Amino acid sequence: GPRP
Amino acid sequence: THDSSIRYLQEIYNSNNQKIVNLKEKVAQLEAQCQEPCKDTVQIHDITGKDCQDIANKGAKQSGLYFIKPLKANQQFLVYCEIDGSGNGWTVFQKRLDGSVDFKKNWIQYKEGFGHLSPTGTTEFWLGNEKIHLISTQSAIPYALRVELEDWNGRTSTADYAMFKVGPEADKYRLTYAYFAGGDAGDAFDGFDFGDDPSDKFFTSHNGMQFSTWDNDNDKFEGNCAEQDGSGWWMNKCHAGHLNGVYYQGGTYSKASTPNGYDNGIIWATWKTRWYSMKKTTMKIIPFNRLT
Amino acid sequence: VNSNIPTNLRVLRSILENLRSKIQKLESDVSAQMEYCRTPCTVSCNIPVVSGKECEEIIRKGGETSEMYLIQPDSSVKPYRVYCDMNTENGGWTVIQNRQDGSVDFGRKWDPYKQGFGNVATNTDGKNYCGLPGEYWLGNDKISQLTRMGPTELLIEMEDWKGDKVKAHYGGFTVQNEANKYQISVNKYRGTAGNALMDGASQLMGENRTMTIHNGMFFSTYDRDNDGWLTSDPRKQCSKEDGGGWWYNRCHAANPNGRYYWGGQYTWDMAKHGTDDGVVWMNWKGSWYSMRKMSMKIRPFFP
Amino acid sequence: VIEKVQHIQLLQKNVRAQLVDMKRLEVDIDIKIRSCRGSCSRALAREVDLKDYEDQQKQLEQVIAKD
Ligand SMILES: *[C@@H]1O[C@H](CO)[C@@H](O[C@@H]2O[C@H](CO)[C@@H](O)[C@H](O)[C@H]2NC(C)=O)[C@H](O)[C@H]1NC(C)=O
Ligand SMILES: [Ca+2]
Ligand SMILES: [Ca+2]
Ligand SMILES: [Ca+2]
Ligand SMILES: [Ca+2]
């Protein structure tokens, strides 16, 4: 997934 | 008079003295049948070569274990070769099919490899990065990469990439490919637009990324992707395709299942939500000029 | 005189009767075992990915669990299977010999001892890899080549039938090739078992003890005599029929390749030839005691 | 005048040897059968009984003490  | 007495004890004696001689012969026969070890089902094939396709081209017909020695390799190593009737030989470098092996490994382990190789292709493993590099860059001949996935309902999907190559350890075994070549699992290595953030996709693509493990951070995050998601992979703040992740019995898992709060499963976002983990995975390469 | 007790010796009849009954039972057992042998035992030892020259190089390449591995000491040798112990005192030990349940015959000729025999490993409860070592002798050609790659140490562990154990560490270990009859050499001892290989049985004195020293001896098998018992009589060889292969002198203070007597304590009337041919280590349990567990592991010294 | 004792005392010398040979054989078969465990599909479970031989062996040594 993505990281802020 | 003890007539027959001493005459009977002589019969018994002489008799079970002839039985002893006979029983000994039978013993030796038994000893002869207990000299061989237990039969081992796993056996290695004689044929060898640069890669599986080379081994295929030399007559190999069945899938199994072979030794191969890429051009620039200084030693031969065992690999699992998938060979079908059409004459195509695949060199498999990654397999998941039951959470029996732990993929939370360090840099050296992902380099040298870990897990086990079976003649039946029924075991989990990671051929090392060093070998994957030697195989895919041994010559100019371009290699293709095929990713196979199976969900918890028998459905399978694939993803193909052309000009697949893994660089040297000098460049953290960087991942590279020219372009996505199709497949119904979707091009997850291209990144995925997860939500509101205007740069989700840019942050989750994989082409060009270096390999990362908890003890050797080479990602584009300020923290440690490999450490959080607990795996070894080509991270980028972090990922959208994660095949060496945590195996979750049944695929479906949640944020509460993880310890850091992030999706750490075996995902492929273009095919399934990141909260669903694959039941089977396979990564293999074959000379590109073999699919075209 | 009269028939006092000449009629009393009827106890001679029960001994014979009983013995005849013992023989019936024995034949039945040998016959049943013969049947069970129509099919062999099997193992599925899937091979670990990680590999190297030997177990030390493998534990440095990430191989953390004790199990069967495939090694290739040299580019000219065909990769072979061996059991690596990755937990005993720093790990990285290549098992060369192992005893633990009497499941394998050790009284073999020169050829089998040269090629190696027995089971390297067996499958664990419910796993796809072989994490349990079996009983085996790696083979003289292989052992020889391994100890000559560079400085090599040897560790010998053993256990009795009470659960107690001891060990014999030899900082230096070498085994020459076949032309040289696999001559043995060991040094830098330390441990809790007695230094049997270099000093001989500790219960003896004079030339009686020095004749049970193994260091410097050639390898012998009941079909190839190279012991230190120099003599013409063909019926006086340290390695008798069904005796193990070993570096006998005249004859021994220890014998890890001896016959596996169940229970430990054995006598001369139990021994096929009346000699102590069991798994022995005199400097610890004496001469008529056979161990429950015995093993030999090697590893590079470092230099 | 007799003609039985000189034969008896000799026969019991042979029965002694047979005991010893039986003891060794009993043990040998016990070791060999266990050796198949690492080769054959299964091995026969069995408990050798030395105590039995021990007694008869001790007993027969009583008679040889007479004449
Ligand atoms: C040293 O060995 C000798 C021989 O094995 C023992 O002395 C005697 O040697 C003669 C052979 O010519 C025989 O009477 C016996 O073999 C021995 N008799 C004894 C003393 O039992 C001697 O005992 C040994 N020394 C020890 C005890 O280690
Ligand atoms: Ca977006
Ligand atoms: Ca970072
Ligand atoms: Ca034998
Ligand atoms: Ca001799």
Fold of domain B43-185+280-292 = Gamma Fibrinogen; Chain A, domain 1 (3.90.215)
Annotate C207-272 with three-state secondary structure. HHHHCCCCCCCCCEECCECCCCCCCCCCCCCCCCCCCCCECCCCCCCEECCCECCCCCECCCCCCC
Q: Is the dihedral of CA C196, C200, C204, C206 positive or negative?
A: negative
What is the dotted CATH code of the domain comprising D1-67?
A: 1.20.5.50
What would you measure as the largest C-alpha separation in chain D, in angstroms? Answer: 63
Q: What is the CA radius of gyration of chain D?
A: 18
- Helix %, strand %, coil % of chain C (to 5): 20, 25, 55
Domains B43-185+280-292 and B186-279 share a fold: no
Q: How many CB atoms lie within 10 A of CB C23?
A: 20
Read off the tokens for C168: 């014999």
Residue nearest atom 8 of ligand 1, based on CA coordinates:
C208
For C217, other C-beta atoms within 10 Å of its C-beta total 24
Ligand 1 neighbours by CB, cut-off 6 Å: C 204-206, 208
Angstroms from D62 CA to nearest CA on chain C: 10
**Which amino acid is present at B94?**
Q
In CATH terms, B186-279 corresponds, of 4.10.530.10, 2.40.50.140, 3.20.20.80, 1.10.645.10, to: 4.10.530.10
Which of C204, C207, C208 maximizes ligand 1 atoms within 8 Å of its Cβ, making it the mutation to test the pocket?
C208
C12, C23, C261 member nearest D11 (Cβ): C12
Distance, in Å, from the CA atom of C100 to the CA atom of C66, rounded to the nearest integer, reads 17
Mention every residue, 6+ apart, whose C-beta is less than 8 A from residue B141: B287, B288, B289
Cβ atoms of C118 and D35 closer than 8 Å: no
Contacts of C103 (CB under 8 A, 6+ apart): C119, C134, C135, D34, D35, D37, D38, D43
Resolution in angstroms comes to 2.6
Q: How far apart are the first and last CA of chain B?
A: 106
- Residue extents of the structural domains in chain D: 1-67
Residues with beta carbon < 5 A to ion ligand 2?
B 193, 200
Cβ C187 vs Cβ C172: under 8 Å: yes
C-alpha to C-alpha distance for C70 and C82, rounded to whole angstroms: 6
Tokens read off for B93 = 């470098």
User: Which bound ligand lies closest to the C-alpha atom of C202?
Assistant: 1
CA dihedral D48, C296, C72, C63 (to 10 degrees): 100
Which residue's C-alpha comes closest to atom 2 of ligand 1? C208
Asked if residue C277 lies in contact with residue C258, where contact means CB atoms within 8 angstroms, the answer is: yes
C156 and C214 Cβ atoms separated by less than 8 Å: no
Task: Test D23 with C269 for CB contact under 8 angstroms.
Answer: yes
> Residue whose CA is closest, atom 6 of ligand 1?
C208
From atom 24 of ligand 1, which residue's Cα is the shortest distance away? C208
For residue C205, the ligand 1 atom closest to its alpha carbon is 28
For D47-56, the CB contacts below 8 A with 24+ separation are D48/C262, D50/C270, D50/D23, D50/D26, D52/C18, D52/C22, D53/D19, D53/D22, D53/D23, D53/D26, D56/C15, D56/C18, D56/D19
Q: What CA–CA distance (Å, rounded) separates B251 from B258? A: 13
| Displacement of CA C11 from its chain's centroid (Å) | 42
Residue type (1 letter), C41: C
Chain A residues whose CB is inside 8 A of the B257 CB are none
> Å from D20 to nearest chain C CA?
6
- Reduced to 3 states (helix: H, G, I; strand: E, B; else coil), residue C199 is helix
Show which of residues 62-91 on chain C sit within 8 Å of chain B, judged by CB atoms.
62-63, 70, 72, 75, 79
Provide CB contacts within 8 A for B184, sequence distance 6+: B157, B158, B271
Facing D35 at nearest CB: one of B13, B20, B34: B34
Q: Is residue B37 within 8 Å of residue C118, measured between CB atoms?
A: yes
The experimental method behind these coordinates is X-ray
Which tokens sit at B74?
């200084």
| Residue B195 annotated as part of some ligand binding site | no
Cα of B195 to nearest chain C Cα, Å:
39
Provide the H-helix boundaries in B125-168.
Answer: 129-136
Determine the Cα–Cα distance for residues C93 and C84; give it in Å rounded to an integer: 6
Q: Do B116 and C34 touch (CB under 8 A)?
A: no
Specify the residue with its C-alpha closest to ligand 1, atom 5. C208
Peptide linkage before C251 cis (omega within 30 of 0): yes
Disruptive mutation site among B9, B26, B34, B35 for chain D (greatest number of D CBs within 10 Å): B34
- Please tell me whether residue C186 adopts helix, strand or coil conformation: strand
Read off the tokens for C280. 């022995």
For residue B155, what are the CA distances in angstroms to B100, B125, B246, C162, C165?
22, 22, 20, 57, 55
One-letter-per-residue 3-state SS of B190-221? HCCCCCCCCCHHHHCCCCCCCCEECCECCCCC
- B217 annotated as belonging to a binding site for a ligand: yes
Q: C245, C194, C259, C195: which is closest to C217 by C-alpha?
A: C245
- Is residue C46 within 8 Å of residue B117, measured between CB atoms? yes
Upper half-sphere CA count for residue B202 (Cβ side, 13 Å): 6
Cα of B173 vs its chain's centroid, Å: 18
Angstrom distance (rounded) from CA B126 to CA B94 = 5
3-state secondary structure of C152: strand
CA separation for the pair B234, B243 (Å, rounded): 10
CB C257 within 8 A of CB C246: yes
Which of C19, C50, C129 lies nearest to residue B16, judging by beta carbons? C19
CB atoms within 10 A of CB C157: 22
Q: Give dist(CA C104, CA B279) in Å, integer.
A: 41
In chain C the domains, ranked by start, together with CATH numbers, are 46-193+293-303 (3.90.215.10), 194-292 (4.10.530.10)
Does residue C19 belong to the interface with chain D, where contact is any CB pair within 8 Å?
yes
Rounded Cα–Cα distance for residues D4 and D14 (Å)? 16
To the nearest whole angstrom, how far is the Cα of D12 from the nearest Cα of chain B?
Answer: 10
* The pair of three-digit structure tokens given for residue C284, joined into one six-digit string: 């610890």
**Rounded CA separation B102/B214 (Å):** 14
Q: Which of C49, C57, C61 to probe the B interface (max B CBs under 10 A)? A: C49
Please name the residue that has the structure tokens 């090629």: C115
Closest by Cα among C128, C126, C142 to C47: C128
Report the distance separating Cα B279 and Cα B151, nearest Å.
5
Please state whether beta strands C47-48 and B125-127 pair in parallel, antiparallel, or not at all (unpaired): unpaired
Residue that the structure tokens 């154990």 belong to = C165
**Given the CA of residue C209, which atom of ligand 1 is nearest to it?**
28
Q: What are the residue ranges spanned by the domains of chain B?
A: 43-185+280-292, 186-279
Residues of chain D by 3-state class (helix, strand, coil), percent to 5: 70, 0, 25
